[PDB]
Amino acid sequence: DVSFRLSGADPSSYGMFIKDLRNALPHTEKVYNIPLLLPSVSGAGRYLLMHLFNYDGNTITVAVDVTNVYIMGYLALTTSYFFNEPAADLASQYVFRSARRKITLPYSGNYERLQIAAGKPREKIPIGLPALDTAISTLLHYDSTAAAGALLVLIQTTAEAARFKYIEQQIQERAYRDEVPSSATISLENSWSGLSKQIQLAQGNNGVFRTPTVLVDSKGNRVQITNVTSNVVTSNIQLLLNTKNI
Numbered sequence: 001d002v003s004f005r006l007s008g009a010d011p012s013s014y015g016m017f018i019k020d021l022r023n024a025l026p027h028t029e030k031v032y033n034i035p036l037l038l039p040s041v042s043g044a045g046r047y048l049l050m051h052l053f054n055y056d057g058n059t060i061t062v063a064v065d066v067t068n069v070y071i072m073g074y075l076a077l078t079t080s081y082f083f084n085e086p087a088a089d090l091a092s093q094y095v096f097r098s099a100r101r102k103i104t105l106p107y108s109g110n111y112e113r114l115q116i117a118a119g120k121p122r123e124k125i126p127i128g129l130p131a132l133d134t135a136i137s138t139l140l141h142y143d144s145t146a147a148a149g150a151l152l153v154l155i156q157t158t159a160e161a162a163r164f165k166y167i168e169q170q171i172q173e174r175a176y177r178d179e180v181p182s183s184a185t186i187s188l189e190n191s192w193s194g195l196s197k198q199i200q201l202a203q204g205n206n207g208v209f210r211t212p213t214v215l216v217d218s219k220g221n222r223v224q225i226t227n228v229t230s231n232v233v234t235s236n237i238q239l240l241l242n243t244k245n246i
């Protein structure tokens with residue numbers, strides 16, 4: 001399991017949590033020195049539990065699929081919640097089975113459905129350590145519209161920061177003030193599958209992407225990534241979605 005406490009949190013303790021989160025995900029191989037997540041894991045071992053604590057010390061446990069870093073559901077006191085999607089329903093066969101009741105949330109976990117439930121794109125939702133504290137608090141009691149926005153904050157500040165060092169730094173910069181994600185942050189989120197596939201296809205193509213990946217940079221400039229020498233590959237991405245899952 002991994003844990004993170006908002007009480008006393010700072011860029012360093014957040015960086016330790018994101019390091020623990022990356023290190024809890026299993027891999028047998030690296031591709032261009034980036035851990036390659038597994039094609040599959042059977043049974044309960046597929047799910048990592050993240051214990052998160054708000055500033056007041058109240059806690060939720062979040063279940064994360066270790067093959068793709070997708071959050072499946074969470075437990076808050078004696079109630080479990082899961083997204084309305086087959087992978088989450090399967091996860092509910094393994095985690096939080098001791099909850100007194102299980103609520104299936106009225107959306108799946110993808111960004112498009114969550115933004116629809118929330119009423120706003122994530123371009124408009126501030127993220128940061130304070131927004132994470134609010135998100136944990138929100139998730140403690142069911143409200144499905146408030147929860148969709150909390151879950152947009154939780155996905156970006158947890159499993160997204162684990163995938164990209166740039167996003168982790170963006171959250172560290174928002175340790176004490178939220179701010180909406182940069183368009184670079186959004187681009188990388190949206191590109192993770194694509195990047196993970198191109199970096200794998202580069203292995204028998206001399207380091208060259210079969211198809212270029214278009215990203216927005218930190219200045220808001222739209223760039224093409226064409227090969228593994230790009231700083232996105234050598235410095236930023238930390239985890240590759242296995243092509244078997246793409």
Ligand SMILES: OC[C@H]1O[C@H](O[C@H]2O[C@H](CO)[C@@H](O)[C@H](O)[C@H]2O)[C@H](O)[C@@H](O)[C@@H]1O
Nearest residue numbers: 069070071072109110111112155159160
């Ligand atoms: O269920 C949690 C994960 O959501 C993030 O990605 C979501 O949004 C995508 C929308 O474009 C979907 O393809 C995907 O199903 C969603 O899961 C992210 O992938 C993970 O870090 C979150 O844990």
Ligand SMILES: *[C@@H]1O[C@H](CO)[C@@H](O)[C@H](O)[C@H]1NC(C)=O
Nearest residue numbers: 208225226227228229230231
């Ligand atoms: C690879 O990447 C860099 C951009 O970061 C580019 O300048 C260079 O021309 C590319 N090399 C090849 C072999 O495509």
